[PDB]
Design a protein around this ligand. Structure first.
Ligand SMILES: OC[C@H]1O[C@@](CO)(O[C@H]2O[C@H](CO)[C@@H](O)[C@H](O)[C@H]2O)[C@@H](O)[C@@H]1O
Ligand SMILES: OC[C@H]1O[C@@](CO)(O[C@H]2O[C@H](CO)[C@@H](O)[C@H](O)[C@H]2O)[C@@H](O)[C@@H]1O
Ligand SMILES: [Ca+2]
Length: 1003
């Protein structure tokens, strides 16, 4: 049972020997001999091709074997194959860390497969440099050959590097290049409020049931309560919060309570709580929110009782739509509407360039109040007004100045870029001709601060330079505007008149406290109160001789000395903070002040005419009575009389005694030292703000920025874009300081007697880290389906799960207290939902079920993998378990080597019988199927073309690299199974000389 050679002591291995009628084969490994006539085809044998197909099957359908989201696969999915073709030669069982790209073995179509090949060659160096680009009409057997080559080379590089880090990077660079897996398939569009280039709304589906909702009532603003009109746009930025969901409404009330009790809750400090709210982005959320805030303020503070109790919680709305005020009035003015009619009237008549400004009459009429003869109180809708804001006429223009100074694209910049752009912006601000800055700021502010029936709001960026550390550098307007502000406290009260004469000159008059009309003789205090204002927008203004401008100061101001507050000059303006050296004018017996093209009593700049300089383009002059005492205070304290009417705020002299300060810019820089922190510095200046007549300080939103860079808010970290609703400089400082600095700022403000406003931002949330498969439809900013988009009821990977430790710590936690203390809040039916808030479920973590949708994320229409027929692949979690065919376990009945009669056939991948071909098995042997499809296994010399002489043992294996000793001589078959003739050969140590018939001569 061994055949050794007795002379050389060597055994013969892989040797077939004839012993009479007996045939003995001595095997490869040990030379162990066995009856050659009894060798049988191993019926468990598989082909080399079959092993390749099986190695690439998924190890399993568990979460760890196949990277997924809710069971769905993505173009980025890596998986654990059953076997790894290690170093591109040896099939080896996979470990659980042997994850591989699904795109190494599967493609959505053969076009993509071909692009994959060209990309892996050109960018991965995974195929020979000089190989033709693969074509659209590329053969599928050619594509498959070279896909296997790529596999082999990938495993080769993985072996030299011991890593797939390079491969994660390369595959995602490749993915990113396909239209179906990038923004090209998302219909990028910036129309309306698609500030980030597009929206996807969340829709109910059986495929993604955990993200379904009974609510998602969209666009339901003050003009669209029932849902039958268009309303404002529901969609704005980032992840849009579904505020029509009763459970979400309860969570907004929870958060509102937190802000109003922030100092108690976070530091046991009753002096560190906010006093009011700014409702941010009102026209972008369910208007039910205005009613929920009202009801809570009514239960906690008794807002509607009297002016005294209401005015102790000044609240304002960011409500841009022109039909909003009537609505705000209808529901009790729980928060002040803005007067956008009036702000626009200022933009149109003062704030434009000399050749853009319109006649000044509109300042009198285009407003919630007609100011021709404003001589009553409690008769109009109460409002706040303003000239600029952190966004309005600041953020766009500043980004223009940044782009112009640096050359970078719009809205992209680093801190050096901001600074250079700020330099350019401030130079523009200080020119006569302005490109990025508003004109006539002195006049605009004079209108702002002398209007009756208005709570004016002063903007930080008009007192201090927008870019820089908090309060670092003053604007050119600081003296002018603060002069106006202290003058407002001291003199501005009572009735108002406005008219525009024949020369287009506006005269604006306040009578002082105790007089509503020009005919009222007023009280004691009236005498040295009131104000007279002359404005023109005509840089070329010239009055003709004799012509004049009359201010009708009134019957309380007959034969009286007035002195200048502000005069226009050639290069600017002159400010006078009191009576010293201020030019004078005298009223006549009628109380009329007269100006002409001539100076009064030889005093320079007391004549009326046009100027054009960095402050004034047109004309500004402001006059008050002389000889007011230095402590004169013209304000009116709110009455604690019971309200006859269901409202909170009333438009009167007490409300008119309030000034809001918007105390930030988007462009405040990050502090370089703790003393530079906005909120520390706010704490140091509360008396300064009080001196200006500021009664409420509007703080920036204090939520920690997402810092994700997906919008201006998360570039300069203003606080409008955040992940965690309850993290107010707590996890780490916000741009303005720690939560400690915040509390100290609030406590210091309260010490001065100032209120403080929390910016309430219930529209949206940014940068949630947890992925979620959601059925989405591409849509405009109202959620109207984008008709040309193929993204329609399509599963899509969203970033919708998370919210921070503070949302987790506090979400829903005060709902108990609220039920206990104010049960009345939980019984109110709100107008859009027509049911109550729902406190029975606490939100401690966000997921898609609580969102109306998201900006487009640039993952691509096809990112979530589906078969040709539209069926989604899935592990089995969210829908039917269905995996690609190359990952799936295949039925092998009829495939591979099948016995039929006394023959073995081989049926290929298409179940095709193979004829006249060699097939290699997974362990290295070759087999030949003859022209009839029949495995040869007869142990006889046979001629085969592709001619050579082959011999196949009874188990069908091609005999090869060995000797055959028959009674008629010995033959040698080479490494390819072909008989050798007529040469000397060497196989290892053995040398074999063969003649022309193949017979062995010597060895
Ligand atoms: O900022 C873009 C755009 O948003 C509006 C919406 O009213 O501004 C308010 O809401 C945004 C998201 O909360 C903030 O970016 C913005 O600062 C805030 O005032 C529009 O005013 C502004 O044009
Ligand atoms: O808001 C109306 C406005 O949206 C536009 C472009 O911003 O169209 C989008 O919204 C449509 C509503 O019918 C989709 O059907 C459409 O595919 C998409 O362009 C404007 O056409 C339309 O005036
Ligand atoms: Ca919204």
């Amino acid at each position: 049972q061994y055949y050794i050679d007795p002379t050389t002591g060597q055994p013969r291995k892989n040797f077939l020997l004839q012993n009479g009628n007996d045939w003995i084969y001595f095997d490869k490994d040990t030379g162990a001999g066995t009856n050659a006539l009894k060798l049988q085809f191993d019926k468990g044998t598989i082909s080399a091709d079959e092993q390749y197909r099986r190695g690439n099957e998924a190890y399993s359908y568990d979460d760890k074997s196949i990277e997924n989201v809710n069971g769905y696969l993505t173009a980025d999915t890596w998986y654990r194959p059953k076997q790894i073709l290690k170093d591109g030669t040896t099939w080896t069982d996979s470990k659980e860390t042997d994850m591989r790209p699904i795109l190494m073995v599967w493609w959505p179509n053969t076009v993509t497969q071909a692009y994959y090949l060209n990309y892996m060659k050109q960018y991965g160096n995974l195929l020979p440099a000089s190989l033709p680009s693969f074509s659209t009409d590329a053969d599928s057997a050619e594509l498959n050959h070279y896909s296997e080559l790529v596999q082999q080379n990938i495993e080769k590089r993985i072996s030299e590097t011991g890593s797939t880090d390079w491969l994660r990077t390369l595959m995602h660079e490749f993915v990113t290049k396909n239209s179906m897996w990038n923004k090209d398939s998302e219909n990028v569009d910036y129309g309306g409020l698609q500030l980030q280039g597009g929206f996807l709304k969340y829709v109910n589906s059986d495929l993604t049931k955990y993200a379904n909702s009974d609510w998602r009532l969209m666009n339901r603003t003050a003009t669209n309560i029932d849902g039958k009109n268009y309303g404002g746009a529901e969609f704005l930025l980032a992840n849009d919060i579904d505020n029509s969901n009763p459970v979400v409404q309860a969570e907004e009330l929870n958060w509102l309570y937190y802000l109003m009790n922030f100092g108690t809750i976070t530091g046991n400090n009753p002096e560190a709580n906010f006093d009011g709210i700014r409702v941010n982005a009102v026209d972008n959320v369910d208007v039910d929110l205005l009613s929920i805030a009202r009801d809570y303020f009514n239960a906690a503070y008794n807002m509607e009782q009297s002016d005294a109790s209401a005015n102790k919680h000044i609240n304002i709305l960011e409500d841009w739509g022109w039909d909003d005020p009537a609505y705000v009035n209808k529901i009790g003015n729980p928060q002040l509407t803005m007067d956008d009619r009036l702000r626009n009237a200022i933009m149109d008549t003062l704030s434009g360039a000399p050749d853009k400004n319109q006649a000044l009459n509109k300042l009198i009429t285009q407003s919630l109040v007609n100011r021709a003869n404003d001589n009553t109180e409690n008769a109009v809708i109460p409002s706040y007004n303003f000239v600029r804001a952190h966004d309005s006429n600041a953020q766009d223009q500043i980004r223009q100045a940044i782009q112009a100074a640096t050359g970078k694209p719009y809205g992209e910049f680093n801190l050096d870029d901001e600074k250079k752009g700020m330099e350019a912006y401030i130079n523009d601000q200080n020119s006569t001709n302005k490109k990025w800055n508003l004109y006539n700021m002195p006049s605009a502010y004079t209108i702002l601060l002398t209007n009756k029936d208005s709570v004016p709001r002063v903007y930080y960026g008009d007192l201090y330079q927008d870019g820089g550390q908090y309060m670092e550098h003053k604007t050119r307007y600081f003296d002018t505007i603060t002069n106006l502000l202290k003058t407002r406290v001291k003199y501005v009260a009572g009735g108002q008149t406005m008219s525009v004469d024949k020369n287009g000159i506006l005269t604006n008059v306040r009578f002082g406290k105790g007089a509503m009309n020009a005919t009222d003789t007023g009280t004691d205090e009236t005498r040295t109160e009131g104000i007279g204002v002359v404005i023109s927008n005509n840089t070329n203004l010239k009055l003709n001789d004799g012509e004049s401008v009359v201010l009708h100061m009134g019957a309380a101001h007959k034969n009286q000395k007035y002195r200048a507050v502000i005069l226009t000059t050639e290069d600017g303006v002159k400010n006078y903070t009191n009576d010293t050296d201020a030019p004078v004018a005298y009223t006549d017996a009628n109380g009329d002040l007269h100006f002409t093209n001539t100076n009064l009593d030889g005093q320079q700049y007391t004549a009326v005419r046009g100027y054009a300089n960095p402050d004034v383009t047109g004309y500004l002059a402001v006059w008050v009575p002389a000889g007011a005492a230095d402590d004169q205070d013209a304000r009116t304290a709110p009455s604690d009389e019971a309200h006859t009417t269901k409202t909170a705020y009333r438009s009167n002299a007490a409300l008119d005694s309030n000034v809001i300060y918007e105390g930030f810019s988007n462009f405040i820089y990050w502090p370089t030292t703790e003393s530079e922190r906005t909120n520390v510095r706010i704490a140091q200046n509360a008396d300064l703000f009080k001196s200006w007549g500021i009664t409420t300080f509007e703080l920036a939103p204090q939520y920690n920025s997402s810092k994700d860079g997906t919008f201006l808010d998360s570039i300069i970290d203003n606080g409008y874009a955040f992940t965690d609703r309850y993290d107010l400089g707590m996890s780490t400082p916000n741009k303005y300081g720690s939560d400690e600095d915040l509390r100290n700022a609030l406590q210091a403000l309260h010490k001065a007697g100032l209120q403080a406003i929390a910016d309430w931002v219930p529209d949206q949330i940014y940068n949630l880290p947890g992925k979620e498969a959601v059925t989405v439809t591409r849509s405009d900013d109202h959620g109207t389906t984008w008709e040309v988009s193929p993204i329609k009821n399509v599963v899509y990977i969203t970033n919708t799960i998370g919210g921070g430790e503070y949302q987790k710590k506090y979400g829903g936690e005060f709902l108990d207290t609220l039920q206990k203390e104010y049960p009345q809040l939980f019984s109110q039916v709100y107008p859009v939902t027509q049911t109550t808030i729902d406190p029975s479920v606490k939100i401690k973590e966000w997921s898609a079920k609580y969102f109306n949708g998201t900006n487009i994320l640039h993952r691509g229409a096809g990112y979530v993998l589906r078969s040709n027929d539209g069926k989604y692949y899935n592990l089995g979690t969210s829908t039917q378990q269905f995996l690609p065919s190359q990952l799936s376990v295949q039925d092998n009945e009829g495939y591979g080597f099948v016995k039929e009669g006394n023959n073995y056939h081989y049926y290929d991948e298409n179940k095709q019988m193979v004829k006249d071909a060699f097939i290699q098995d997974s362990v290295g042997n070759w087999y030949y199927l003859d022209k009839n499809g029949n495995m040869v296994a007869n142990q006889s010399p046979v001629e085969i073309s592709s001619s050579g002489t082959y011999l196949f043992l009874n188990n069908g294996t091609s005999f090869r690299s060995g000797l055959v000793k028959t009674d008629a001589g010995t033959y040698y078959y080479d490494g390819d199974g072909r008989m050798v003739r007529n040469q000397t050969v060497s196989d290892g140590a053995m040398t074999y000389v063969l003649d022309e018939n193949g017979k062995l001569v010597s060895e």
